[PDB]
Write a protein that binds this ligand. Structure first.
Ligand SMILES: O=C(O)[C@@H]1Cc2c(O)c(O)c3c(c2N1)[C@H](C(=O)O)C[C@H](C(=O)O)N3
Ligand SMILES: O=C(O)[C@@H]1Cc2c(O)c(O)c3c(c2N1)[C@H](C(=O)O)C[C@H](C(=O)O)N3
Lengths: 238, 238
């Protein structure tokens, strides 16, 4: 609970300290990168993570819509080009889907997206729509915290995904530099740390939803049906 | 998947059929009303449900803000008076909190609210903000689907809560009558069923979050800390 404004370097350290709560520490993530995850768990992960990825560009556009500074927009738009392509990351993820046995329609349809994942992700969007652009922009800085096994995974799609993700052009540090410039009072600094925590909560909550469904055999409505019964529509956009 | 517009009576039956997915069928809810719930589970439930309750009036006001029909507003505002009082339901829930051993500050602070609960609830609000008023209004119709044991529970607060909830004046059927009037095409009807499913998903997801935290010993960041580390702020409103 910051009492006296921290310096920019010290603030950066505090922000980086929040990485301790990054989602790589979630048992579900651990199990996937341990090879202890089942195939159900893997396909679930890709389908659900895809929703996040298709939301990012909407989230970034929301930020731009709220940002009257042309130079900031000139940088921010590169995030949208990265995701949308013109291949792009959405496309790269479609290839990973294929590699793990899911069709493009399976993914594009968003039919497999668990409501807990949806709500967590949409929270990110709705923050970006409503928050001052600086705050929303800064929340992107968690990207700084970043099979075989699984023989059944198609090498070619994989490498394809891994590879497309590697040509992104956005300035991943932008959020950080902004936060250090913008958060120049104790009050802003504490609030920024809480915004970071919000973002970390989104990522952890996505994984909790996946844990319940694919690892604990407790998907939505499991006591009442064996079919997927959850809503599958971005109701206010579609 | 409605192909030919249903009649109003048949549509009502379809809507009521969605009650099969109501949250009373969630293992967490079952355990509470079975007396199989632990005290941790109960206090968690009250603290987390409280967030829903404090959001309802915001949700209802959002609907009104989107509703240029004065007569509709004249009815809808009664929902806000019910919750806000002037005692009201928010107050009634504060008394139940007391009955189960939680202080007013504990509840009002929203500090115990799990992020999964928060995201699910905020989804409701953000739907209400953005959707046409008719759609948002109709989603309220799930209210139509509606300790000892637990000796440690204070009878007086309880009865107090149970009792205040019983003097609400809103027209719980309003959403239904609107849906029957408004949803006069196959397309609107299918969409309304999907909106209902959305609402049901919110309620189930709230309970999943509670299940993970209080029943499966898997609250957020459990692999990294034993303290509550999640964000506790309505960032865009506070
Ligand atoms: O908020 C944002 O705009 C960024 C955009 C983004 C990505 O493109 C990821 O692939 C991506 C993240 C983000 N966040 C995630 C993030 O930290 O938010 C990390 C996650 C991962 O692979 O672990 N991948
Ligand atoms: O969407 C809405 O406006 C209504 C308002 C409301 C309440 O006041 C509840 O107590 C309340 C609900 C709702 N929904 C819940 C709902 O069905 O949405 C049910 C739940 C229960 O006690 O089981 N309690």
């Amino acid at each position: 609970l910051i009492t006296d404004t921290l310096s920019p370097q010290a603030f950066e350290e505090a922000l980086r300290a929040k990485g301790d709560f990054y989602h790589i520490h979630h048992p579900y993530h651990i199990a996937m990168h341990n090879g202890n995850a089942t195939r159900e768990q893997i396909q679930g992960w890709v389908a659900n993570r895809f929703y996040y990825q298709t939301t990012i560009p909407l989230k970034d556009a929301a930020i731009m819509a709220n940002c009257p500074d042309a130079q900031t927009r000139r940088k921010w738009v590169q995030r949208i080009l990265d995701h949308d392509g013109s291949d792009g990351g959405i496309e790269a993820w479609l290839r990973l889907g294929e590699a793990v046995g899911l069709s493009r329609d399976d993914l594009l349809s968003e039919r497999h997206v668990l409501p807990g994942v949806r709500f967590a992700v949409d929270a990110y969007l709705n923050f970006a729509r409503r928050a001052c652009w600086q705050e929303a922009a800064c929340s992107s800085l968690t990207e700084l915290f970043a099979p075989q096994h699984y023989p059944w995974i198609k090498e070619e799609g994989y490498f394809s995904f891994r590879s497309s993700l590697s040509q992104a052009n956005r300035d991943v540090e932008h959020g950080l530099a902004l936060a250090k410039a913008y958060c120049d009072s104790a009050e802003k600094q504490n609030r920024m740390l809480e915004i970071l925590q919000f973002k970390l909560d989104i990522l952890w909550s996505m994984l909790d939803a996946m844990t319940m469904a694919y690892a604990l055999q407790r998907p939505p409505y499991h006591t009442v049906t064996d079919k997927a019964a959850w809503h599958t529509t971005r109701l206010v956009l579609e």
